[PDB]
Amino acid sequence: MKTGRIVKSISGVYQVDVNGERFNTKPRGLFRKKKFSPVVGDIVEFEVQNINEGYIHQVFERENELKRPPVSNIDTLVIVMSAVEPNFSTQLLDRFLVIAHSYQLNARILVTKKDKTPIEKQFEINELLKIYENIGYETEFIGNDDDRKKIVEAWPAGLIVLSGQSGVGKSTFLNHYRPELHVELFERQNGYIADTPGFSALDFDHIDKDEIKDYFLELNRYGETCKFRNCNHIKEPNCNVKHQLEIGNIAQFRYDHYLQLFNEISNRK
Ligand SMILES: Nc1nc2c(ncn2[C@@H]2O[C@H](COP(=O)(O)OP(=O)(O)O)[C@@H](O)[C@H]2O)c(=O)[nH]1
Ligand SMILES: [Zn+2]
């Protein structure tokens, strides 16, 4: 009877947004069981009752999902990094992109605190952000002089989830969408933006050492012409990644972070 996105879950009641319209609903069939329980971000078919209430009959197949917090069908993961306080880190950024792609997410890169970054440092970060744009990511570098609402409404349509450490500047964006002014979705013009971040932790537990190269997008792309179909680009001969490194089309820090994570993600915790 109606199709929409779950924007709130409160003690087994699922609020479903239907183009602005809100419905408090409960699951039936499979969706009453824990192994099929609805999550915020689910697209659902529900039966309308009592004007603004309803029963969820179908939860559509999840295109993607985070477990902590539990949220499904993210259209863009915005990785939020400070330029300073703390200092921008390609080591932390590469790790967040690996996690992002391991969850099958679209990712883009947002650097904050430009207005208090030394201008010489701004040029070094700008050159780093160029390397990520050559890999295929959209990047922005913003400060207090920038319109945070204009920025969010230029983002691709659908569900945006901000992921990054506390203090990087997620709330400064999110407060523009808080009606009051465990995960809830807030409306924006072309979709939603999420209450919570996506990660930071031992979201490495599910990753096989063999998958790490798939989530370095330029290694994955250049590995197409390595001799070996599963070349790890470490000791293998005829390696196209090590060649592209040599002639300067893969950045050394990217290769070095791949190597550290390949060596680390193997290890017992
Ligand atoms: N100067 C400056 N400070 C910022 C910027 N973005 C965030 N902050 C500050 O950094 C701190 C953390 O911001 P907040 O949005 O609460 O971070 P969250 O923990 O990631 O949500 C706060 O004191 C913010 O006002 C920025 O672009 N420039
Ligand atoms: Zn290779």
Side-chain angles (χ1 to χ4, degrees), residues 223 226-228 231-234 236-242:
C226 293
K227 174 168 177 185
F228 298 103
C231 191
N232 276 332
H233 337 284
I234 297 167
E236 294 87 339
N238 304 305
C239 174
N240 186 40
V241 161
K242 272 177 300 158

